[PDB]
Amino acid sequence: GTRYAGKVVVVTGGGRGIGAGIVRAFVNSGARVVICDKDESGGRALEQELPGAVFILCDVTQEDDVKTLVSETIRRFGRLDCVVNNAGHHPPPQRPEETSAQGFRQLLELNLLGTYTLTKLALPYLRKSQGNVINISSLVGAIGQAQAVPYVATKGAVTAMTKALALDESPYGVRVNCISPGNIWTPLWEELAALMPDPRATIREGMLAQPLGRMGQPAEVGAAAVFLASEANFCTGIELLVTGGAELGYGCKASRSTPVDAPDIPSG
Amino acid sequence: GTRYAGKVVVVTGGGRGIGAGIVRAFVNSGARVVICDKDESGGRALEQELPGAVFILCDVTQEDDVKTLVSETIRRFGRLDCVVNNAGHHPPPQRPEETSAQGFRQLLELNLLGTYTLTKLALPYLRKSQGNVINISSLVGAIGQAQAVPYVATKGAVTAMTKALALDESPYGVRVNCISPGNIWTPLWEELAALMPDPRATIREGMLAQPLGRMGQPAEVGAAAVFLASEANFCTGIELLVTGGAELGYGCKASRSTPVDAPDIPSG
Amino acid sequence: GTRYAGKVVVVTGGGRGIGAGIVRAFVNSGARVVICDKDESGGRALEQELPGAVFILCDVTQEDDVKTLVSETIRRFGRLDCVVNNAGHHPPPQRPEETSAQGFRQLLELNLLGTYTLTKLALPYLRKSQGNVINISSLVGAIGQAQAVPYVATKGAVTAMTKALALDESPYGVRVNCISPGNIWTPLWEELAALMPDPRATIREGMLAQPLGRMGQPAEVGAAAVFLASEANFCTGIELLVTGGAELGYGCKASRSTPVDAPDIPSG
Amino acid sequence: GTRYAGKVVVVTGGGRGIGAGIVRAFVNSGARVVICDKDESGGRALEQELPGAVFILCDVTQEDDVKTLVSETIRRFGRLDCVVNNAGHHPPPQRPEETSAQGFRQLLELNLLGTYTLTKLALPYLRKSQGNVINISSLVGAIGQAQAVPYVATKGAVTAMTKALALDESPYGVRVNCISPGNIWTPLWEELAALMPDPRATIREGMLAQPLGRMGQPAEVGAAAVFLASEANFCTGIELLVTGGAELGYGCKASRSTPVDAPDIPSG
Ligand SMILES: NC(=O)c1ccc[n+]([C@@H]2O[C@H](COP(=O)([O-])OP(=O)(O)OC[C@H]3O[C@@H](n4cnc5c(N)ncnc54)[C@H](O)[C@@H]3O)[C@@H](O)[C@H]2O)c1
Ligand SMILES: NC(=O)c1ccc[n+]([C@@H]2O[C@H](COP(=O)([O-])OP(=O)(O)OC[C@H]3O[C@@H](n4cnc5c(N)ncnc54)[C@H](O)[C@@H]3O)[C@@H](O)[C@H]2O)c1
Ligand SMILES: NC(=O)c1ccc[n+]([C@@H]2O[C@H](COP(=O)([O-])OP(=O)(O)OC[C@H]3O[C@@H](n4cnc5c(N)ncnc54)[C@H](O)[C@@H]3O)[C@@H](O)[C@H]2O)c1
Ligand SMILES: NC(=O)c1ccc[n+]([C@@H]2O[C@H](COP(=O)([O-])OP(=O)(O)OC[C@H]3O[C@@H](n4cnc5c(N)ncnc54)[C@H](O)[C@@H]3O)[C@@H](O)[C@H]2O)c1
Ligand SMILES: O=C(O)c1ccccc1O
Ligand SMILES: O=C(O)c1ccccc1O
Ligand SMILES: O=C(O)c1ccccc1O
Ligand SMILES: O=C(O)c1ccccc1O
């Protein structure tokens, strides 16, 4: 592959799940990939497996880690063409009264402000390279999700901030886009399902949520990212849905504790 | 009620279902309402029950009926303030290979071109009154629907044409908006459910499609219409969703004939 | 007016601008309105002018102020039917490198977490009343805005969180919706324009941004809010646009420092 | 290139403009491309220039031409993997009173029913190949356009029908997606600009409509199409925007004949 040959790419949270999918997709396209992750285990494993992937330990909520990540990427590689803000977390299901403003704040540090800080520090270099930014939002930013008020809020923020940055940076030719994956089968998905009374039933409901009848794969988000960076030169501020059609058509939305009348009083 | 007192309102398909809901809502607001319907039974009944509602027999696919409707409304009432394009039909479920281009054309005559013809003839009078147009689209125009390719297409057209008209008519101060109802309990809904092997199970799936756990009522669309005409003077080209939240969150979207793997191969 | 008679309504930032528009609209509908504002001047003025409007000093970023606001509203009035989260701020234009993570955080405290905290504390009472929540987001949450990365992000968060809450609260019958105003002529708009080299030229560009050719008024957002609370019982999780059509059609989007070729090389 | 090697692709309107962009992009990916066009000049030229591109004369509004196109593609190539419905026309600017129902109908035959007829006949073969459909809609389907009520309506229909087909065809694994290009520099764009009093000023306004400051190219839509067909296996029913950001941020929307007050009465 040569669609992104020699470009320098930073992927946050690139050590597993969707981030690793994106890392492999960019390596496959010929890029130099800086894996940024707070966990050294998965990243150093990719670094050793994929030459041209390199691991730099970095928590994106720690402003110094991000300055050092950026500082090292330029020092080590002389340029920066693409930033894929992927580091993010989804808490276990929580009703609104089970969330705290403190938890919300911590989650904004990761999902939103981490994405913002790396982008701020990266923009002077992306301007020189006429690079682009890719943020990994989520479909629930667009249509909501049950028991995930903080998470949904951070993803609504990422998608909107992507459009704001696209306007601020178009005078420099720097594109700024986001991918909104639906249900992607990842360790995070697996870890969350394992907290449920019936994990496999929960995973099954995850697959049935798509007209296509399955969850997506990290590789498929990785292809979407490589397309945005390498072949979508007239795309900026877009929200690319990788969702298997989950947002389409009617479905079972009234919840298992939601009072529903019998079908003889259909409209109350 | 006085929020729309003495304004002259035309409601197509106003003889039953959502159209009658809208007719009652405008009468309640003090308007003069011209009920336009191809069926005389339901309309003349409203005309007799509601003074200030008046029935004019008119098939909106028949250009002469629409010229005569418009011609009679001005002759009889001297002005035209509001056109609610509601006349529309939803065919029984049909797979794509069960539709014909002829059926599609007939359905466009009603759902789209009927709305277009009345609007064209009404605009010279709406310009003088600084009136507005309200089109009744559907949520499936926005998110699709199974087994309804022609219907969905006509509703995608209505929603888009609403925005085109809003731009063409804003120099005159004529607002042009649409309501996109989700599942509304109406005779049409009832007639379609009755074609199913299990009508009440189908109606129940209709109610479960909403987080609110019920279908909407015609009166609730009627309130939305009266709000658009009488109190939304800074609204034009909007799509007002009356859907009970159907478009929100994940749901059961993989269809009963869609191959789905077991939850041990979640992503294929 | 009687469309919301005797319901108890809290409006944050109700002391001027859009908040005061909403306060007057609910008072006009017959509600008991608790004006919540951090500035006593504008609120106490409304409290004295409008009986049935009452002012309670409260900064929504101060968790104790919000507990006390909620505690006093129930103690004083015995119920809570409607929360209009309107308190919000738009900073002066700032390029991305002119924003700080600290400023972003402060802005999230107001625009997002203030809305979240009042909603959390209000929900137990809204559940009993089968009330509803109305958040005042912004159109730029949906389509972005130049030189406003933090602000846009907080409004993307508000709009998404509205959908998350609508799902979490539909089992209780509590609707949760937002209004996304476009350009509304308010003191905040005036204050921001006054920071510009040519205020009136800037205000003029604000009016030209709408096909309707003007900015909106607070009263028009107030009507939209009263409609959501009092007549949109089948609406939840919707984004109601009060924008004068700003999001429609093509416009002048390439910025005054954006390199644009001459029209003989149209596509680069 | 090998991303779509040996797949059989039909591109309607493939003889020039965006269609030819898509044809070259698929040929470049290794596909067998059947150029379908009503004009033989541009298509036979591509057929001779690009081996593996083949031209079949076909007007998509003529049901027999489409049956013969489909019949010949299978007979000649034994399979059908991808249908790119691109044939479409944009009439010169027309106010609503300058359109006729007849013109509207003719435009629906091309833009909508042509897309529908080829898809119907192609689906039995796409099911066997687990192929996909790509419709070329337009951004104005989503946000409207001035003086283009019929055109906008047909494109609203194409985008919605894409979602309906995606639901109907997901049980077979057949993806169905659309691209919504903004302003793309093509012969059609050039022909329309040439009808204006100042063509180059009009082209310049076309470029300024994008934050990126230029129009798109056919090659860029071609890349988007090849991505949808060859690498977006978890995408169905999506609307991929190729618009240079035109839908983002505020712009000059109040039209040159739209009454606008001076900036001392900003909100009427
Ligand atoms: N899995 C899904 O279905 C899904 C859906 C929509 C969006 N997303 C988004 O995709 C991204 C990845 O999701 P996933 O399922 O692959 O997650 P994951 O948990 O499987 O992997 C996330 C990676 O990010 C790293 N990370 C976490 N916090 C970090 C921090 N502070 N600094 C640096 N690295 C950090 C983790 O160590 C891990 O390697 C997230 O932003 C998530 O919100 C996922
Ligand atoms: N019912 C729903 O759930 C639902 C959902 C979304 C949109 N809608 C739309 O709302 C509108 C009304 O739906 P409904 O369920 O109330 O339907 P309905 O069948 O119950 O009533 C429709 C009315 O329109 C009249 N009509 C039909 N064809 C006409 C024609 N050619 N000329 C004049 N009048 C004509 C009928 O005679 C009838 O009185 C339609 O446009 C429909 O697409 C309905
Ligand atoms: N003006 C516009 O064009 C526009 C457009 C879109 C959205 N909005 C939103 O509408 C809301 C009001 O905007 P506006 O133009 O009327 O603003 P404004 O400045 O004119 O009034 C805002 C009010 O909120 C109060 N407030 C501010 N911070 C507060 C806090 N921490 N606690 C309590 N009260 C607080 C202020 O004292 C003031 O009374 C904001 O949320 C804003 O983002 C405004
Ligand atoms: N140019 C733009 O800015 C733009 C923007 C949005 C969408 N689009 C869409 O993209 C498509 C192509 O646009 P373009 O600008 O490249 O147009 P174009 O006029 O430059 O080329 C269109 C091609 O389609 C062919 N065609 C027309 N009618 C046909 C018919 N009945 N049967 C078969 N072939 C037919 C023409 O002969 C021509 O080769 C259209 O569907 C258009 O609506 C274009
Ligand atoms: O849809 C999501 O955003 C999501 C993210 C991580 C894990 C499970 C999920 O459903
Ligand atoms: O959702 C619709 O458009 C609809 C319309 C009429 C009848 C049943 C329906 O689901
Ligand atoms: O569009 C906005 O969100 C806005 C809000 C406050 C002031 C000016 C504005 O344009
Ligand atoms: O935006 C469009 O759909 C379009 C299509 C063809 C020509 C010019 C255009 O603006």
Tab-separated table of N, CA and C and ligand atoms in Angstrom, chain A residues 250, chain B residues 12-19 36-39 58-61 85-90 110-111 136-139 151 155 180-189 191, ligand 2:
chain	number	residue	atom	x	y	z
A	250	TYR	N	-37.328	1.888	12.001
A	250	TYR	CA	-37.879	1.715	13.336
A	250	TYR	C	-37.255	0.503	14.025
B	12	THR	N	-55.298	19.818	3.168
B	12	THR	CA	-55.590	18.710	2.271
B	12	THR	C	-55.636	17.418	3.071
B	13	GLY	N	-56.464	16.489	2.612
B	13	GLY	CA	-56.645	15.255	3.352
B	13	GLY	C	-57.145	15.485	4.757
B	14	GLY	N	-57.900	16.552	4.963
B	14	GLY	CA	-58.376	16.955	6.261
B	14	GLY	C	-59.578	16.203	6.758
B	15	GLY	N	-60.037	15.185	6.021
B	15	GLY	CA	-61.280	14.517	6.351
B	15	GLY	C	-61.192	13.463	7.436
B	16	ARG	N	-59.990	12.990	7.767
B	16	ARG	CA	-59.823	11.991	8.819
B	16	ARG	C	-58.357	11.970	9.227
B	17	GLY	N	-58.034	11.096	10.176
B	17	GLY	CA	-56.653	10.901	10.567
B	17	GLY	C	-55.954	12.178	10.981
B	18	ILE	N	-54.714	12.325	10.522
B	18	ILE	CA	-53.906	13.473	10.915
B	18	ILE	C	-54.491	14.763	10.352
B	19	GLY	N	-55.029	14.709	9.129
B	19	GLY	CA	-55.626	15.900	8.549
B	19	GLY	C	-56.753	16.460	9.399
B	36	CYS	N	-59.911	20.186	2.445
B	36	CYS	CA	-59.803	19.614	1.113
B	36	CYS	C	-59.599	18.112	1.254
B	37	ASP	N	-60.476	17.331	0.624
B	37	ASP	CA	-60.356	15.882	0.652
B	37	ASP	C	-60.993	15.322	-0.606
B	38	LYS	N	-60.473	14.180	-1.064
B	38	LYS	CA	-61.099	13.472	-2.179
B	38	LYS	C	-62.322	12.672	-1.741
B	39	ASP	N	-62.448	12.361	-0.450
B	39	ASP	CA	-63.588	11.629	0.087
B	39	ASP	C	-64.536	12.608	0.761
B	58	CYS	N	-62.003	17.814	-3.485
B	58	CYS	CA	-60.831	18.103	-4.300
B	58	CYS	C	-59.795	16.996	-4.203
B	59	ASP	N	-59.444	16.407	-5.340
B	59	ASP	CA	-58.346	15.455	-5.428
B	59	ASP	C	-57.099	16.234	-5.809
B	60	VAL	N	-56.069	16.167	-4.963
B	60	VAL	CA	-54.931	17.057	-5.171
B	60	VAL	C	-54.074	16.610	-6.337
B	61	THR	N	-54.316	15.417	-6.879
B	61	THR	CA	-53.624	14.976	-8.088
B	61	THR	C	-54.303	15.467	-9.355
B	85	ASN	N	-50.251	20.949	3.597
B	85	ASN	CA	-50.256	19.841	2.643
B	85	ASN	C	-50.160	18.542	3.434
B	86	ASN	N	-51.306	17.908	3.665
B	86	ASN	CA	-51.367	16.685	4.453
B	86	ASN	C	-51.801	15.456	3.650
B	87	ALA	N	-52.556	15.630	2.568
B	87	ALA	CA	-53.020	14.498	1.776
B	87	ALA	C	-51.851	13.616	1.370
B	88	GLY	N	-51.961	12.335	1.691
B	88	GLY	CA	-50.889	11.398	1.426
B	88	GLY	C	-51.357	9.992	1.709
B	89	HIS	N	-50.632	9.030	1.144
B	89	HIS	CA	-50.987	7.629	1.297
B	89	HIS	C	-49.738	6.799	1.528
B	90	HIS	N	-49.883	5.760	2.342
B	90	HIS	CA	-48.810	4.791	2.563
B	90	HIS	C	-49.276	3.439	2.049
B	110	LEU	N	-49.613	11.878	-5.717
B	110	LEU	CA	-50.282	12.236	-4.482
B	110	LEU	C	-49.314	12.889	-3.503
B	111	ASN	N	-48.295	12.146	-3.082
B	111	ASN	CA	-47.517	12.551	-1.918
B	111	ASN	C	-46.670	13.783	-2.198
B	136	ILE	N	-46.721	17.894	5.515
B	136	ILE	CA	-46.697	16.774	6.446
B	136	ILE	C	-45.851	15.682	5.803
B	137	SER	N	-44.586	15.598	6.214
B	137	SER	CA	-43.697	14.607	5.637
B	137	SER	C	-43.808	13.327	6.443
B	138	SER	N	-42.680	12.793	6.902
B	138	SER	CA	-42.645	11.627	7.773
B	138	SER	C	-41.217	11.401	8.243
B	139	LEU	N	-41.083	10.830	9.442
B	139	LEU	CA	-39.760	10.474	9.955
B	139	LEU	C	-39.035	9.475	9.048
B	151	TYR	N	-42.832	5.001	-0.901
B	151	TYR	CA	-43.330	5.931	0.104
B	151	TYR	C	-42.195	6.747	0.693
B	155	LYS	N	-41.538	10.986	0.645
B	155	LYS	CA	-41.368	11.767	1.869
B	155	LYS	C	-39.973	12.395	1.967
B	180	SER	N	-42.586	16.067	10.590
B	180	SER	CA	-42.254	14.683	10.271
B	180	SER	C	-42.795	13.791	11.375
B	181	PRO	N	-44.050	13.362	11.298
B	181	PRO	CA	-44.571	12.496	12.356
B	181	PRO	C	-43.936	11.123	12.270
B	182	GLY	N	-43.665	10.541	13.435
B	182	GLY	CA	-43.391	9.122	13.511
B	182	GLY	C	-44.678	8.320	13.433
B	183	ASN	N	-44.838	7.309	14.287
B	183	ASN	CA	-46.028	6.451	14.282
B	183	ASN	C	-47.200	7.175	14.941
B	184	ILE	N	-48.194	7.565	14.144
B	184	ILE	CA	-49.397	8.234	14.641
B	184	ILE	C	-50.567	7.270	14.476
B	185	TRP	N	-51.333	7.062	15.541
B	185	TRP	CA	-52.473	6.146	15.458
B	185	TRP	C	-53.595	6.800	14.655
B	186	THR	N	-53.848	6.303	13.444
B	186	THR	CA	-54.843	6.848	12.524
B	186	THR	C	-55.568	5.722	11.805
B	187	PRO	N	-56.669	6.007	11.102
B	187	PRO	CA	-57.300	4.954	10.280
B	187	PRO	C	-56.344	4.290	9.298
B	188	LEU	N	-55.476	5.078	8.666
B	188	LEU	CA	-54.477	4.515	7.769
B	188	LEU	C	-53.583	3.526	8.502
B	189	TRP	N	-53.097	3.901	9.694
B	189	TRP	CA	-52.325	2.944	10.482
B	189	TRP	C	-53.152	1.699	10.744
B	191	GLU	N	-55.791	0.526	9.047
B	191	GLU	CA	-56.023	-0.236	7.826
B	191	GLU	C	-54.797	-1.054	7.447
E	2	LIG	N1	-50.194	7.754	10.231
E	2	LIG	C1	-48.875	7.867	10.426
E	2	LIG	O1	-48.257	7.214	11.299
E	2	LIG	C2	-48.121	8.844	9.577
E	2	LIG	C3	-46.748	8.952	9.797
E	2	LIG	C4	-46.000	9.858	9.071
E	2	LIG	C5	-46.621	10.638	8.125
E	2	LIG	N2	-47.946	10.513	7.911
E	2	LIG	C6	-48.573	11.346	6.804
E	2	LIG	O2	-49.671	12.038	7.332
E	2	LIG	C7	-50.670	12.204	6.301
E	2	LIG	C8	-51.988	11.674	6.791
E	2	LIG	O3	-51.778	10.334	7.281
E	2	LIG	P1	-52.954	9.582	8.047
E	2	LIG	O4	-52.380	8.408	8.747
E	2	LIG	O5	-53.745	10.566	8.821
E	2	LIG	O6	-53.814	9.112	6.787
E	2	LIG	P2	-55.354	8.769	6.569
E	2	LIG	O7	-55.487	7.724	5.522
E	2	LIG	O8	-55.888	8.268	7.918
E	2	LIG	O9	-56.064	10.141	6.080
E	2	LIG	C9	-55.589	10.740	4.858
E	2	LIG	C10	-56.671	11.607	4.276
E	2	LIG	O10	-56.215	12.137	3.010
E	2	LIG	C11	-57.234	11.968	2.050
E	2	LIG	N3	-56.625	11.880	0.732
E	2	LIG	C12	-55.945	10.808	0.217
E	2	LIG	N4	-55.603	10.946	-1.042
E	2	LIG	C13	-56.085	12.202	-1.377
E	2	LIG	C14	-56.081	12.927	-2.583
E	2	LIG	N5	-55.558	12.469	-3.721
E	2	LIG	N6	-56.666	14.145	-2.586
E	2	LIG	C15	-57.211	14.598	-1.452
E	2	LIG	N7	-57.282	14.002	-0.256
E	2	LIG	C16	-56.704	12.796	-0.290
E	2	LIG	C17	-57.960	10.697	2.473
E	2	LIG	O11	-59.233	10.596	1.844
E	2	LIG	C18	-57.997	10.889	3.994
E	2	LIG	O12	-59.105	11.673	4.420
E	2	LIG	C19	-50.123	11.502	5.063
E	2	LIG	O13	-49.543	12.477	4.215
E	2	LIG	C20	-49.108	10.519	5.654
E	2	LIG	O14	-48.040	10.176	4.780
E	2	LIG	C21	-48.703	9.649	8.614
